[PDB]
Amino acid sequence: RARNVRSHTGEYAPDILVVGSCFLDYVGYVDHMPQVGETMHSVSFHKGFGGKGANQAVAAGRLGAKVAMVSMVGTDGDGSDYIKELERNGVDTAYMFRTGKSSTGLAMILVDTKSSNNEIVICPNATNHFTPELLRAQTNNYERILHTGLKYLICQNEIPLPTTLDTIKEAHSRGVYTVFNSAPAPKPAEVEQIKPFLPYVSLFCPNEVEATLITGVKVTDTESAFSAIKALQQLGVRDVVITLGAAGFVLSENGAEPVHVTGKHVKAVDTTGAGDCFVGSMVYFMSRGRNLLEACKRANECAAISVTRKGTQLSYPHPSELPAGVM
Amino acid sequence: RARNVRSHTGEYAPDILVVGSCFLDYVGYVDHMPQVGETMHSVSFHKGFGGKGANQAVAAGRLGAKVAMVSMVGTDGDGSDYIKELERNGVDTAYMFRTGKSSTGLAMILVDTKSSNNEIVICPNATNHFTPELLRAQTNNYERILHTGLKYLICQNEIPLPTTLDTIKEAHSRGVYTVFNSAPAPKPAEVEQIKPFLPYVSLFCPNEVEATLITGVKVTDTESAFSAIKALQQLGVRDVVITLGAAGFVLSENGAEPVHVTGKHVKAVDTTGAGDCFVGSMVYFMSRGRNLLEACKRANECAAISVTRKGTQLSYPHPSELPAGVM
Numbered sequence: 184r185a186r187n188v189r190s191h192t193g194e195y196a197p198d199i200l201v202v203g204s205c206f207l208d209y210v211g212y213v214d215h216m217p218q219v220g221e222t223m224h225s226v227s228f229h230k231g232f233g234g235k236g237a238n239q240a241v242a243a244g245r246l247g248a249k250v251a252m253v254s255m256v257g258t259d260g261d262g263s264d265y266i267k268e269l270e271r272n273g274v275d276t277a278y279m280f281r282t283g284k285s286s287t288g289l290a291m292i293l294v295d296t297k298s299s300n301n302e303i304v305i306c307p308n309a310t311n312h313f314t315p316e317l318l319r320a321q322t323n324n325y326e327r328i329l330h331t332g333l334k335y336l337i338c339q340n341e342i343p344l345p346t347t348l349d350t351i352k353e354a355h356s357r358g359v360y361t362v363f364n365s366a367p368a369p370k371p372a373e374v375e376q377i378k379p380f381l382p383y384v385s386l387f388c389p390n391e392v393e394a395t396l397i398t399g400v401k402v403t404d405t406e407s408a409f410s411a412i413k414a415l416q417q418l419g420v421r422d423v424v425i426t427l428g429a430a431g432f433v434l435s436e437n438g439a440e441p442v443h444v445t446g447k448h449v450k451a452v453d454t455t456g457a458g459d460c461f462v463g464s465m466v467y468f469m470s471r472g473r474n475l476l477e478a479c480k481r482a483n484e485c486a487a488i489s490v491t492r493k494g495t496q497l498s499y500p501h502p503s504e505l506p507a508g509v510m
Numbered sequence: 511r512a513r514n515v516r517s518h519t520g521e522y523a524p525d526i527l528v529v530g531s532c533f534l535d536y537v538g539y540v541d542h543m544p545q546v547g548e549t550m551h552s553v554s555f556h557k558g559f560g561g562k563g564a565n566q567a568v569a570a571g572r573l574g575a576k577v578a579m580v581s582m583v584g585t586d587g588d589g590s591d592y593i594k595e596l597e598r599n600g601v602d603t604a605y606m607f608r609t610g611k612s613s614t615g616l617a618m619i620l621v622d623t624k625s626s627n628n629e630i631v632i633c634p635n636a637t638n639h640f641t642p643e644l645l646r647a648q649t650n651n652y653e654r655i656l657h658t659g660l661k662y663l664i665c666q667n668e669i670p671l672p673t674t675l676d677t678i679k680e681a682h683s684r685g686v687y688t689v690f691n692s693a694p695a696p697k698p699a700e701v702e703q704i705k706p707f708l709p710y711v712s713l714f715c716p717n718e719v720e721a722t723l724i725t726g727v728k729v730t731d732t733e734s735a736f737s738a739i740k741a742l743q744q745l746g747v748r749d750v751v752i753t754l755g756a757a758g759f760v761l762s763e764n765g766a767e768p769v770h771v772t773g774k775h776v777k778a779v780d781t782t783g784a785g786d787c788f789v790g791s792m793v794y795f796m797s798r799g800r801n802l803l804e805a806c807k808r809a810n811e812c813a814a815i816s817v818t819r820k821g822t823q824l825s826y827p828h829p830s831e832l833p834a835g836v837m
């Protein structure tokens with residue numbers, strides 16, 4: 184067994200539960216994108232650990248979070264690699280489920296660095312079977328994963344939507360603070376299903392596109408983003424944060440006058456996984472007892488640092504690396 | 511340790527050594543090929559076991575061959591997956607080498623079923639570091655893999671060419687019967703490098719294009735294949751087989767009159783890996799004491815069975831499938 188084992192007394196029960204995706208990233212660097220019918224060699228290849236779920240768990244785990252990942256992977260080597268990698272990044276793997284009927288989820292990513300273009304084919308694989316009925320059957324109807332001690336849940340939109348929504352609703356009903364980062368952007372049928380569940384979301388933390396999709400409010404800038412916040416409160420969300428890339432974020436705590444904190448000015452080299460860094464860092468800081476604004480200010484700093492180098496998860500900071508005054 | 515362990519007395523020593531490639535095939539089925547900058551989902555996914563080296567070993571191993579694979583893969587789970595798959599298909603893995611510095615070799619394959627088109631990006635990864643110098647370092651200058659009792663070596667052209675050529679030369683100097691299937695097709699500088707080594711090749715088994723490239727004879731058919739055999743004999747190759755797809759094969763044993771055997775009349779569904787099936791099966795039959803012609807006739811029948819099913823290694827026959835008198 185690679186996975187962690189729980190105690191019978193819950194001595195290692197997490198502060199933060201992440202219920203979401205784990206994908207291996209198969210990154211092939213190419214001189215040109217393949218034409219239809221073309222066979223080519225890569226110039227090089229990089230194996231990386233992705234999935235927004237894992238990314239967010241790892242962001243928090245790297246900062247020292249008491250975080251556990253709930254997901255589905257294969258019984259294959261990729262699954263075993265991911266389970267070990269999560270542990271090496273401070274993420275508990277006791278509720279990583281494995282199926283022998285599917286490969287671990289992955290992305291096949293082609294990168295032309297010359298052109299700075301990508302082509303990406305997502306293969307959710309095992310992830311497709313990460314259903315509410317399975318989750319229930321494996322967790323005694325969420326009992327095993329939603330202990331009284333649990334403070335935060337993080338979900339994204341990269342597993343079957345009913346798993347995300349049902350989990351959020353259950354967690355909320357037990358007084359867990361629920362965090363929903365609706366990424367990747369919900370499709371129209373997804374928006375419809377999400378909206379009735381927004382009263383069970385403590386913190387909705389979208390980007391500009393996703394805020395637009397949910398609210399109808401076209402978000403391009405601060406003023407419009409504030410408008411989207413109001414719309415999201417009206418849909419029943421308690422706390423709202425909208426990330427704005429290089430423009431930082433806006434937020435409102437429990438309906439207070441919103442605030443804008445602009446981005447840290449840095450040299451962006453690779454912004455892949457920056458949002459996931461922000462979300463995971465944000466929840467870590469809240470678990471350490473900071474309020475929403477204090478958390479988001481520090482999350483904003485961690486994500487800025489992440490965009491200054493390549494590597495996705497590898498670009499996420501550890502505490503010793505951070506400039507004084509972040510932790 | 512997933513790999514086999516060799517004995518000190520060498521009681522499990524193989525008849526057939528395959529020194530070549532192991533590639534995982536990561537196949538994403540798509541409704542359309544991605545355009546530059548596009549992120550999309552697959553409609554389904556399949557993980558296959560490929561690489562011409564492994565394919566040829568598994569074709570032999572399926573028939574019961576005492577075969578061993580010499581190759582390099584990662585310390586990654588992908589590498590462990592291949593090592594187990596090889597064992598399950600009757601291939602000894604004691605001289606599989608593993609590197610922590612490279613991923614396991616793979617191909618990233620996009621298939622549009624509707625349009626019957628593919629895009630393939632080959633990522634040799636670990637394979638690119640499977641050098642003569644590394645091989646020698648790990649095998650005490652080949653002594654560990656070229657035991658007295660060794661009857662056959664099979665090589666292809668899917669690892670660094672110096673590794674292939676040096677291995678052939680060494681094996682041949684020890685009285686091993688060396689088999690060289692120059693696939694994929696040699697490039698012009700590879701042809702130049704190969705020709706001086708052809709006297710160390712017991713059995714050169716190219717397809718029509720490869721034979722053309724090596725000899726300068728334009729090979730399209732039986733009569734031009736026969737001409738190519740002569741040119742190959744002139745370059746110092748003892749035994750020649752040229753495979754002709756649906757038209758079967760031609761051969762000459764040790765300068766005897768050339769023979770043509772036509773292809774079996776089957777409904778070709780998927781010919782992927784049929785050549786590898788031919789070559790691997792051929793050498794198994796020779797290890798059982800069939801002469802070249804007898805062995806090639808039976809290889810031709812195995813390869814025929816293989817084209818009647820999808821899935822490359824999945825299409826390679828077991829002994830129960832073969833008509834009377836083949837085994």
Ligand SMILES: Nc1ncnc2c1ncn2[C@@H]1O[C@H](COP(=O)(O)OP(=O)(O)O)[C@@H](O)[C@H]1O
Nearest residue numbers: 426427428429431451454456457458483486487
């Ligand atoms: N170019 C940048 N400079 C500084 N910070 C950035 C930059 N891009 C992203 N960030 C940080 O990452 C957060 C999320 O940005 P976003 O563009 O959504 O990331 P992603 O590339 O993962 O979508 C922002 O709120 C900000 O804190």
Ligand SMILES: Nc1ncnc2c1ncn2[C@@H]1O[C@H](COP(=O)(O)OP(=O)(O)O)[C@@H](O)[C@H]1O
Nearest residue numbers: 753754755756758773778781783784785810813
């Ligand atoms: N259409 C076919 N009909 C019968 N046998 C075939 C056919 N295609 C391939 N074969 C068998 O496979 C061998 C190699 O064929 P080839 O076309 O080189 O395979 P590949 O498709 O792997 O390139 C042939 O010598 C023959 O025995």
Ligand SMILES: [Cl-]
Nearest residue numbers: 184185186266
């Ligand atoms: Cl496990």
Ligand SMILES: [Cl-]
Nearest residue numbers: 231232496497
């Ligand atoms: Cl990584």
Ligand SMILES: [Cl-]
Nearest residue numbers: 285286308309
């Ligand atoms: Cl799968």
Ligand SMILES: [Cl-]
Nearest residue numbers: 421435437438
């Ligand atoms: Cl609010």
Ligand SMILES: [Cl-]
Nearest residue numbers: 446447448449
């Ligand atoms: Cl700044």
Ligand SMILES: [Cl-]
Nearest residue numbers: 496497498499
């Ligand atoms: Cl790191």
Ligand SMILES: [Cl-]
Nearest residue numbers: 511512513593
């Ligand atoms: Cl091993």
Ligand SMILES: [Cl-]
Nearest residue numbers: 558559823824
């Ligand atoms: Cl396979």
Ligand SMILES: [Cl-]
Nearest residue numbers: 612613635636
């Ligand atoms: Cl590599």
Ligand code: NA
Nearest residue numbers: 247248249273
């Ligand atoms: Na931790």
Ligand code: NA
Nearest residue numbers: 453489492498
């Ligand atoms: Na980065």
Ligand code: NA
Nearest residue numbers: 571573574600
């Ligand atoms: Na066997």
Ligand code: NA
Nearest residue numbers: 230231264586
């Ligand atoms: Na790895």
Ligand code: NA
Nearest residue numbers: 574575576600
């Ligand atoms: Na065997």
